[PDB]
Design an enzyme around this catalytic site. Sequence first.
Site, PDB file in Angstrom:
ATOM      1  N   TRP A  75       0.692  -1.188   0.112  1.00 17.13           N
ATOM      2  CA  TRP A  75       0.090  -0.079  -0.127  1.00 17.13           C
ATOM      3  C   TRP A  75       0.918   1.267  -0.007  1.00 17.13           C
ATOM      4  O   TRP A  75       0.390   2.247  -0.710  1.00 17.13           O
ATOM      5  CB  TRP A  75      -1.013   0.018   1.099  1.00 17.13           C
TER       6      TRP A  75
ATOM      7  N   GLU B 200      -4.326   7.240  -4.156  1.00 18.60           N
ATOM      8  CA  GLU B 200      -3.974   8.560  -3.305  1.00 18.60           C
ATOM      9  C   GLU B 200      -3.300   9.630  -3.837  1.00 18.60           C
ATOM     10  O   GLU B 200      -2.694  10.407  -3.182  1.00 18.60           O
ATOM     11  CB  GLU B 200      -3.791   8.235  -1.706  1.00 18.60           C
TER      12      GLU B 200
ATOM     13  N   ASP C 286      -3.057  13.359   6.878  1.00 19.07           N
ATOM     14  CA  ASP C 286      -3.743  12.335   7.508  1.00 19.07           C
ATOM     15  C   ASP C 286      -5.326  12.336   7.176  1.00 19.07           C
ATOM     16  O   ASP C 286      -5.779  13.447   6.962  1.00 19.07           O
ATOM     17  CB  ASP C 286      -3.637  12.334   8.931  1.00 19.07           C
TER      18      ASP C 286
ATOM     19  N   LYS D  14      -7.730  11.545   8.795  1.00 12.37           N
ATOM     20  CA  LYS D  14      -8.692  12.043   9.893  1.00 12.37           C
ATOM     21  C   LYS D  14      -8.717  13.433   9.737  1.00 12.37           C
ATOM     22  O   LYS D  14      -9.677  14.258  10.021  1.00 12.37           O
ATOM     23  CB  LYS D  14      -8.018  11.548  11.231  1.00 12.37           C
TER      24      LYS D  14
ATOM     25  N   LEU E 116       8.377   1.848  18.490  1.00 10.06           N
ATOM     26  CA  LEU E 116       8.075   1.538  17.161  1.00 10.06           C
ATOM     27  C   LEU E 116       7.076   2.062  16.364  1.00 10.06           C
ATOM     28  O   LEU E 116       6.013   2.686  16.985  1.00 10.06           O
ATOM     29  CB  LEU E 116       7.594   0.090  17.686  1.00 10.06           C
TER      30      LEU E 116
ATOM     31  N   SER F 273       3.716   1.883  13.431  1.00 12.23           N
ATOM     32  CA  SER F 273       3.084   1.237  13.134  1.00 12.23           C
ATOM     33  C   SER F 273       3.089   0.504  11.804  1.00 12.23           C
ATOM     34  O   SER F 273       2.383  -0.726  11.637  1.00 12.23           O
ATOM     35  CB  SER F 273       1.624   2.144  12.912  1.00 12.23           C
TER      36      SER F 273
ATOM     37  N   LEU G 184       9.952   4.000   6.470  1.00 11.17           N
ATOM     38  CA  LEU G 184      10.152   5.073   7.343  1.00 11.17           C
ATOM     39  C   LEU G 184       9.153   6.327   6.827  1.00 11.17           C
ATOM     40  O   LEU G 184       9.002   6.663   5.526  1.00 11.17           O
ATOM     41  CB  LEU G 184      11.535   5.571   6.774  1.00 11.17           C
ATOM     42  N   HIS G 185       8.576   6.720   7.990  1.00  4.84           N
ATOM     43  CA  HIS G 185       7.761   7.922   7.730  1.00  4.84           C
ATOM     44  C   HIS G 185       7.657   8.873   8.769  1.00  4.84           C
ATOM     45  O   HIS G 185       7.970   8.564  10.059  1.00  4.84           O
ATOM     46  CB  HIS G 185       6.274   7.358   7.361  1.00  4.84           C
ATOM     47  N   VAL G 186       7.644  10.060   8.540  1.00  2.87           N
ATOM     48  CA  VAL G 186       7.811  11.186   9.557  1.00  2.87           C
ATOM     49  C   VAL G 186       6.552  12.123   9.684  1.00  2.87           C
ATOM     50  O   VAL G 186       5.867  12.389   8.748  1.00  2.87           O
ATOM     51  CB  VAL G 186       8.880  12.206   8.908  1.00  2.87           C
TER      52      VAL G 186
END
Lengths: 282, 284
Positions: free
Chosen positions: B131, B141, B161, B163, B226, B228, B232-234
């Site tokens: 994904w 997306e 995000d 949300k 950790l 999710s 790597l994501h910031v």
Amino acid sequence: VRLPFSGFRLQKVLRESARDKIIFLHGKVNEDAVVILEKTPFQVEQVAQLLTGSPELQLQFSNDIYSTYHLFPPRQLNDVKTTVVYPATEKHLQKYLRQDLRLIRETGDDYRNITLPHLESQSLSIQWVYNILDKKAEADRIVFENPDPSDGFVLIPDMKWNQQQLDDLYLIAICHRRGIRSLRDLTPEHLPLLRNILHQGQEAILQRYRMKGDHLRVYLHYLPSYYHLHVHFTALGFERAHLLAEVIENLECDPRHYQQRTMTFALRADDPLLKLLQEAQQ
Amino acid sequence: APVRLPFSGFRLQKVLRESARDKIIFLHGKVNEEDAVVILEKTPFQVEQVAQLLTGSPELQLQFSNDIYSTYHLFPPRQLNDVKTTVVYPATEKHLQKYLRQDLRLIRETGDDYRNITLPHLESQSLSIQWVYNILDKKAEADRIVFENPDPSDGFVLIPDMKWNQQQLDDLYLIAICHRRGIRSLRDLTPEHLPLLRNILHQGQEAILQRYRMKGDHLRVYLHYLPSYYHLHVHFTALGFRAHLLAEVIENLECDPRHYQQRTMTFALRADDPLLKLLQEAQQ
């Protein structure tokens, strides 16, 4: 029965929190007034009986197993804590104004050249801390003490914590040694004090409250609210925080870590320190 | 319509989760005696209705006064009393442990623990990152991407995000996902990643300045360990809205090239997480 004034015109929204269900409002009455509305926490018993007997519901969304509603409870679940300040002054308006925070990164040189001189120019008293260490205040509340004047500390539960449940466990260790303003003053000389706080603090908490070390966060704040080293012990459930275990390992790995490295923290937009650090950085 | 619940009779068996701070409660009850989860949350105030009510004659009871201050219980009209109510029926065992209060334990993972325990555990789970690749390859997306540095090695994509609805800056929440593959988390970062990390920090903040008029000193830029998921994501999040600040990650790598392979990391796991048990056994 009635509010102390008649009439209410909203001049400003001082501070809102959607998560906490609170609002602070500056109004003009008749002169000035601050009214604070806060929705109240649920009581398990009131909600239990409400769901057994025909609630007033109004569908918003539905799909298979999930479905949201608007509920309109009886008068008893609807009470709102309402604080009113009248007459309200300019000092009450700035007190309830939402803190407009700004991040800043303070180098070791910034600390020496800007922050510390500013701190010293303010003449902030920590006599109240010395009164606790000398047992003139709060001695009755002490949970544990290592009395060593160099490597010792006192462990004291927060005044707000009633000590009846572990979910909000919150204690502070204040070191006996004087002159350690904050994280910035820590050197390898302090390793025995830091280890004592970490290990003796957790063992005192395990014995006194039956809470294991892996249920606790043990940390300091930079910018602290006062400038005598103190360490937080907090239940896990309950740019500022620094784990004690990591402070120790940093000092072991790099002796000058906290004098040389850059620290990051938030400051109020109107804080004079923030203006001073920004001017020096450009 | 004045709808009813899809079941009859609600006997409480357990209070799953509760927060006095957030004014929410999560209830597990037996019905038609099936399981059901009912969630009640008090609603935030709307400014228009509050001002309207106080200008009239509200229903109040004085608790106490101290001179200019006075405290009351207010019983407002129906409109201000709305409680958001979520019903899950029928509830299964998975729904119950989903809403149950987290029971967390802190663990300290040494560099050797990561190599010997954590990584092999991660690898035995074959958690798909496809994904993520679909987003980076513009197969999914793509219209949600807010900014891209297309460089294969030092580039990234910045996405809001889901949300967050981009209407107010108080809850600004974006994620930068790097184009480079195979960086699972903080644990894989070395000095060769310094160009990428600097780009995310700087070009990410500058993209947010352009798009949302939000200065960088209003923003928290950080990673989780950790995480999710294991690419790597910031995070870029408003100050007004575990974690490792990206600027500090960069400086750690500049000072100590092997920092994230050698040093000990601290994080919380659920008490029933198989990883927790694996790390505790290794350490005991």
